[PDB]
């Protein structure tokens, strides 16, 4: 649900769309994440590992 569950009822949203929201939140246009979705997911996965 992203951050919505903290403010009220949890509203579901696809995770990549939530990541696009958050990329907007730091001043990067969402097309950047949609174009680097796989690279970003791999970077996150390796960071967790």
């Amino acid at each position: 649900s992203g951050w919505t569950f903290g403010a009220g009822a949890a509203l579901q949203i696809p995770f990549a769309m939530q990541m696009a929201y958050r990329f907007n939140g730091i001043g990067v246009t969402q097309n950047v994440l949609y174009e680097n979705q796989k690279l970003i997911a791999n970077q996150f996965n390796s960071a967790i590992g």
Partner: peptide, 19 residues
């Protein structure tokens, strides 16, 4: 983009500039 969908994106200018 993964998840992109085929649809029309309307243009306000096109019908107008024809006039």
């Amino acid at each position: 983009v993964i998840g992109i969908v085929n649809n029309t994106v309307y243009d306000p200018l096109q019908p107008e500039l024809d006039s």
